[PDB]
Design a protein around this ligand. Structure first.
Ligand SMILES: CCc1cccc2c3c([nH]c12)[C@@](CC)(CC(=O)O)OCC3
Ligand SMILES: CCc1cccc2c3c([nH]c12)[C@@](CC)(CC(=O)O)OCC3
Ligand SMILES: CCc1cccc2c3c([nH]c12)[C@](CC)(CC(=O)O)OCC3
Ligand SMILES: CCc1cccc2c3c([nH]c12)[C@](CC)(CC(=O)O)OCC3
Length: 581
């Protein structure tokens, strides 16, 4: 286009344009205040309007990365606050943008955002545009790979909560359960999209395509191969652009894809009808989270073409990607009861069987039993989901999380206590989400969400690497991640952590904390116990943590809380060392 910025301005409209630009700037430089960003946004928008008037004007010819990057480099106190990004500003495009992306920050470690119901309603009423603008800023700078359009969607849910609850009788009780519900949903979108960006970064575009072929085929089993090809291609392009900070390009293609899917919903899925009767952002989001379609009656038998056919080696050798693509498509349609990564593991085994069999003297007799190689791949995760859900049903979320914190601290004791506690808690929430579902949905839910949690762990590991075992699981294979982490056991080389009694010391401040924040503190001690006594059994550790919980309960219920913690605390810390031998 003659002017790219004018094009995107005209298409998306001013409101979305300004939103997406705000988000973009908030993601790249997370430390600058909100009012500085507002000024950058306004300056870029004014330029787009000026360009939209006369597209042949000076500088309107420039690309989006040129104009956006130029703008980023004008920021006050750039070299001081972001030395790393200021190094990029000397470079030209496309080198500069690639430098910007390289030096983004997954753990900015900003202050936690408390929902302050009284004061936020006041700020909402006085200036809603500023208030909702601030929400975009605050979420974007804490989640640097969030997809712009999807954040704009969740901003409308946020606004809708504050219109409903601020005029109402009780401000907190209306708003708090809605805001925590919106948090959960926002965190899930973020986790999914970060996995897609992580898949590009670590494994490449081919990996994103294959994941997407598997998932879309499951969701849209009645869509023909060429239809799924079209959608995955466009979707992969959306992902690539949103992950590489091309937010205006991302919003446009994402909107076109939603439009396309809804134009052709009769040849894609019958579950899209309600999603397609919605406004722009609502529609895109609904499609992305649409339930799987019912299995077609006429799904083909696969043994003939993929196991029994006599010229598979020739067909495979002619074009591997097309042949395996076709296999993955067909096998994924008929298996909505498998996880995405299981399907990719099965495809990898299919490939491996043909690589082996087609080198042997009589290939067809070798590859005749190829589908039977899948049996042990299917039963391994089916057992672990049944085992863990049985455990979760028996003991509940808190004890299940503790079981996993012990499990993972033994695997990787070099990881920081906060990270181990975070990952064990997140992994435990998969039990509460998935084990309650119908049993045919348990496996996919579980493994699909474990992947999100493990990718979080892997991203944290890129920042602060501590363990070669984690690096191998994170970097070797996307499909093998969850099995790789499961296969890890206690490393027999790890030196048990130096005993500091201060680590296991509690005080009366714990008593006034919320129940979640109490658990976290106990769970942190649990991790530290494992670090000091790595060979202690899970039953020993559970028993000792029970003694910690009882101690905290009695002293928080005492007349003189601090005298109780001081007297009873050292006794418990000393005896607990002996109980963990
Ligand atoms: C005002 C409090 C609030 C309300 C609603 C949603 C959220 C989300 C968050 N806080 C919310 C956070 C931070 C911005 C939570 C986090 O990252 O821990 O990440 C987005 C969803
Ligand atoms: C149908 C199978 C298939 C086909 C083409 C490319 C890939 C890649 C993969 N599978 C492919 C994987 C998983 C997504 C393999 C892996 O990491 O184990 O990541 C690399 C590209
Ligand atoms: C166009 C709608 C859409 C269609 C089909 C699959 C997806 C997926 C997504 N959108 C999809 C998302 C969200 C779950 C990314 C996004 O937020 O845009 O991530 C992967 C799967
Ligand atoms: C190479 C990565 C790849 C992996 C798994 C399946 C597919 C499919 C494709 N690529 C795949 C294509 C092949 C035409 C789209 C494309 O890349 O042009 O269509 C859907 C099936």
């Amino acid at each position: 286009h003659k002017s790219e910025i004018a094009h995107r301005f005209n298409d998306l409209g001013e409101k979305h344009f300004k939103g997406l630009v705000l988000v973009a700037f908030s993601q790249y430089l997370q430390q600058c205040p909100f009012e500085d960003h507002v000024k950058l946004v306004n300056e870029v928008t004014e330029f787009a309007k000026k360009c939209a008037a006369d597209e042949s004007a000076e500088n309107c010819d420039k690309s989006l990365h040129t104009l956006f990057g130029d703008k980023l480099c004008t920021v006050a106190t750039l070299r001081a606050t972001y030395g790393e990004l200021a190094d990029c500003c000397e470079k030209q495009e496309p080198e500069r943008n690639e430098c910007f992306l390289t030096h983004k920050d997954d753990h900015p470690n900003l202050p936690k955002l408390k929902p302050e119901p009284d004061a936020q309603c006041a700020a909402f009423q006085e200036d809603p545009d500023k208030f909702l603008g601030k929400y975009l800023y605050e979420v974007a700078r804490r989640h640097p790979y969030f997809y712009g359009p999807e954040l704009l969607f969740h901003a409308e849910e946020y606004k809708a909560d504050f219109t409903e609850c601020c005029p109402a009788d009780d401000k907190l009780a209306c708003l708090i359960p809605k805001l925590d519900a919106l948090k959960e949903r926002i965190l899930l979108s973020s986790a999914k999209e970060r996995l897609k960006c992580s898949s590009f970064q670590n494994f490449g575009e081919r990996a994103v395509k294959a994941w997407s072929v598997a998932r879309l085929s499951q969701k849209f089993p009645k869509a023909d191969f060429a239809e799924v090809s079209k959608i995955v291609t466009d979707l992969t392009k959306v992902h690539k652009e949103c992950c590489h900070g091309d937010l205006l390009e991302c919003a446009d293609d994402r909107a076109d894809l939603a439009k396309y899917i809804c134009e052709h919903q009769d040849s894609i899925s019958g579950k899209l009808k309600a999603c397609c009767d919605k406004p722009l952002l609502q529609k895109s989001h609904c499609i992305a989270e649409v339930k799987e379609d019912d299995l077609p009656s006429d799904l083909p038998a696969l043994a003939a073409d993929f196991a029994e056919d006599k010229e598979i080696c020739k067909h495979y050798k002619d074009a591997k990607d097309v042949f395996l693509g076709t296999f993955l498509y067909e096998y994924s349609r008929r298996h909505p009861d498998y996880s995405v990564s299981l399907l990719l593991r099965i495809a990898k085994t299919y490939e491996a069987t043909l690589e082996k069999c087609c080198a042997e003297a009589d290939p067809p007799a070798c590859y005749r039993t190829v589908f039977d190689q899948f049996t042990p791949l299917v039963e391994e995760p089916k057992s672990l989901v049944k085992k863990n859900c049985d455990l979760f049903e028996e003991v509940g979320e808190y004890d299940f999380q503790n079981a996993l914190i012990v499990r993972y601290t033994k695997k990787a004791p070099q990881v920081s206590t906060p990270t181990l506690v975070e990952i064990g808690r997140t992994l435990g929430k998969v039990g509460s989400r998935c084990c309650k579902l119908p049993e045919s949905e348990r496996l996919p839910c579980s493994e699909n969400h474990l992947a999100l949690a493990l990718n979080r762990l892997c991203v944290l590991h890129e920042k602060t690497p501590v363990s070669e075992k984690i690096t191998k699981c994170c970097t070797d294979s996307l499909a093998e991640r969850r099995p790789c982490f499961s296969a890890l056991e206690l490393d027999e080389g790890y030196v048990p952590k130096e005993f500091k009694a201060e680590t296991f010391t509690f005080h009366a401040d714990i008593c006034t904390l919320p129940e979640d924040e109490k658990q976290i503190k106990k769970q942190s001690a649990l991790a530290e116990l494992v670090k000091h006594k790595p060979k202690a059994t899970k039953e020993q550790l559970k028993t000792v943590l029970g003694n910690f919980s009882a101690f905290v309960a009695k002293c928080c219920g005492a007349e003189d809380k601090e005298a109780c913690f001081a007297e009873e605390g050292p006794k418990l810390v000393a005896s607990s060392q002996l109980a963990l031998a």
